[PDB]
Write an enzyme that holds these catalytic residues in place. Structure first.
Site, PDB file in Angstrom:
ATOM      1  N   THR A 196      18.034 -18.483   5.122  1.00 30.31           N
ATOM      2  CA  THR A 196      17.622 -19.371   4.040  1.00 30.31           C
ATOM      3  C   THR A 196      16.564 -20.386   4.491  1.00 30.31           C
ATOM      4  OG1 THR A 196      19.574 -20.742   4.499  1.00 30.31           O
ATOM      5  CG2 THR A 196      19.735 -19.156   2.687  1.00 30.31           C
ATOM      6  N   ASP A 215       1.531   7.202   7.452  1.00 31.02           N
ATOM      7  CA  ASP A 215       0.677   6.390   8.310  1.00 31.02           C
ATOM      8  C   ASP A 215      -0.025   7.267   9.353  1.00 31.02           C
ATOM      9  OD1 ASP A 215      -0.075   4.033  10.146  1.00 31.02           O
ATOM     10  OD2 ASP A 215       1.021   3.030   8.526  1.00 31.02           O
ATOM     11  N   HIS A 236      -0.532   2.259  15.068  1.00 30.66           N
ATOM     12  CA  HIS A 236      -0.221   1.560  13.826  1.00 30.66           C
ATOM     13  C   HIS A 236       1.058   2.104  13.161  1.00 30.66           C
ATOM     14  CE1 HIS A 236      -1.450  -0.550  10.014  1.00 30.66           C
ATOM     15  NE2 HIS A 236      -0.920   0.527   9.463  1.00 30.66           N
ATOM     16  N   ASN A 241      -5.305  -6.713   3.051  1.00 28.48           N
ATOM     17  CA  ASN A 241      -5.663  -7.828   3.927  1.00 28.48           C
ATOM     18  C   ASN A 241      -7.018  -8.447   3.604  1.00 28.48           C
ATOM     19  OD1 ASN A 241      -3.306  -7.050   5.259  1.00 28.48           O
ATOM     20  ND2 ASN A 241      -4.403  -6.043   6.944  1.00 28.48           N
ATOM     21  N   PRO A 269       1.800  -0.629 -10.828  1.00 32.13           N
ATOM     22  CA  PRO A 269       2.925  -1.481 -11.234  1.00 32.13           C
ATOM     23  C   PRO A 269       4.318  -0.990 -10.836  1.00 32.13           C
ATOM     24  CG  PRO A 269       1.398  -1.144 -13.060  1.00 32.13           C
ATOM     25  CD  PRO A 269       1.014  -0.168 -11.988  1.00 32.13           C
ATOM     26  N   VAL A 290       5.515   0.609  -8.205  1.00 37.23           N
ATOM     27  CA  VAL A 290       5.940   0.552  -6.808  1.00 37.23           C
ATOM     28  C   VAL A 290       6.042  -0.906  -6.355  1.00 37.23           C
ATOM     29  CG1 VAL A 290       4.924   2.801  -6.370  1.00 37.23           C
ATOM     30  CG2 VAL A 290       3.617   0.707  -5.840  1.00 37.23           C
ATOM     31  N   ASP A 295       4.887  -7.968  -5.819  1.00 36.76           N
ATOM     32  CA  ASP A 295       6.298  -8.056  -6.170  1.00 36.76           C
ATOM     33  C   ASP A 295       7.101  -8.926  -5.213  1.00 36.76           C
ATOM     34  OD1 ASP A 295       6.491  -5.961  -8.434  1.00 36.76           O
ATOM     35  OD2 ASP A 295       5.462  -4.892  -6.821  1.00 36.76           O
ATOM     36  N   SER A 355       0.396  -4.595   6.384  1.00 35.18           N
ATOM     37  CA  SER A 355       0.978  -3.389   6.990  1.00 35.18           C
ATOM     38  C   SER A 355       2.287  -3.671   7.728  1.00 35.18           C
ATOM     39  CB  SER A 355       0.005  -2.755   7.996  1.00 35.18           C
ATOM     40  OG  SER A 355      -0.925  -1.879   7.380  1.00 35.18           O
ATOM     41  N   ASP A 374       9.594 -20.965  -1.644  1.00 36.13           N
ATOM     42  CA  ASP A 374       9.578 -21.514  -0.287  1.00 36.13           C
ATOM     43  C   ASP A 374       8.277 -21.296   0.487  1.00 36.13           C
ATOM     44  OD1 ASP A 374      12.193 -22.516  -0.576  1.00 36.13           O
ATOM     45  OD2 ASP A 374      13.041 -20.567  -0.007  1.00 36.13           O
TER      46      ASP A 374
HETATM   47 CA    CA Z   1       7.709  -2.761  -8.939  1.00 35.25          CA
END
Ligand code: CA
Length: 279
Positions: A16, A39, A69, A161, A175, A177, A200, A224, A260
């Site tokens: 938290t 990847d 990566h 990035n 939208p 994913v 999201d 990533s 936060d």
């Molecule tokens: Ca979503």
């Protein structure tokens, strides 16, 4: 369970508050789930994977991760020391070459591959896909990500990035994913992290220690790196029976640390991935 002196991002996802160093998680640890890492590949032989990683597909002359990566991202999903879901099964799909590049047509093929391939795997607790990649807006790339999600896979994708609105990037802008931005250890939006309405969730993305090729380890930064925290979290929560592929992004947002993060632009969610684990 408690892992002391964990990478800051793992500690963050079970806390938290920022500024702690122990990762707390239910011992089930994603057992019985599967995460595809789409990847540059995964160095399956890395001791950190404990035999739980394997390459299942490549579009190039080798399935070897000659970049690092993909191995790093896979490590954040599920390595013993650096991973969120320490008992998940990891499947590598090499859509990116050893320079970290990939044609959209190959990336699309890889997504459709995963949608079918899960039917050849044992994942009783559920299936996740982590896509730490992206480029300019493409309806075809978005549609492929949407199909993968529709097929019963929790799809987590990097926001990008560019320190810009992710609406102009794919698959970030899809939208359906779960689009993942990056934060740092002081709960600031990572300086490179994309933002916007299409995001999201945020996850740890600056200075993330994980596995690297040649049996090594490395700290690197990017959306990533944030993406596999969310993918691993989804797998972990699915093993606990708290959510499903179709609902995991929503559930993660529902249960996130709220309000936060700093330097979140007006109109972007202020939500940080959180496992809500009470030891
Ligand atoms: Ca979503």
């Amino acid at each position: 369970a408690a892992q002391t002196n964990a990478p800051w991002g793992l500690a963050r996802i079970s806390s938290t508050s920022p500024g702690t160093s122990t990762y707390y998680y239910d011992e089930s640890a994603g057992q019985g789930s599967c995460v595809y890492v789409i990847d540059t590949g995964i160095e399956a032989s890395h001791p950190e994977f404990e035999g739980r990683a394997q390459m299942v597909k490549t579009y190039y002359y080798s399935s070897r991760d000659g970049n690092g990566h993909g191995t790093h991202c896979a490590g954040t999903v599920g390595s013993r020391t650096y991973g969120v879901a320490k008992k998940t099964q990891l499947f590598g799909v090499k859509v990116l070459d050893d320079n970290g590049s990939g044609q959209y047509s190959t990336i699309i093929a890889g997504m459709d591959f995963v949608a079918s391939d899960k039917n050849n795997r044992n994942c009783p607790k559920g299936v996740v896909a982590s896509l730490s990649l992206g480029g300019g807006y493409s309806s075809s790339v978005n549609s492929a990500a949407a199909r993968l999600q529709s097929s019963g896979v929790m799809v987590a994708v990097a926001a990008g990035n560019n320190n810009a609105d992710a609406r102009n990037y794919s698959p970030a802008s899809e939208p359906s994913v779960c689009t993942v931005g990056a934060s740092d250890r002081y709960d600031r939006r990572s300086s490179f992290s994309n933002y916007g309405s299409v995001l999201d969730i945020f996850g740890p993305g600056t200075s993330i220690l994980s596995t690297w090729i040649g049996g090594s380890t490395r700290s690197i930064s990017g959306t990533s790196m944030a993406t596999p925290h969310v993918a691993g979290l989804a797998a972990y929560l699915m093993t606990l029976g708290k959510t499903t592929a179709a609902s995991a992004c929503r559930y993660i947002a529902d249960t996130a640390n709220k309000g936060d993060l700093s330097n979140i632009p007006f109109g972007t969610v202020n939500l940080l991935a959180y496992n809500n684990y009470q030891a």
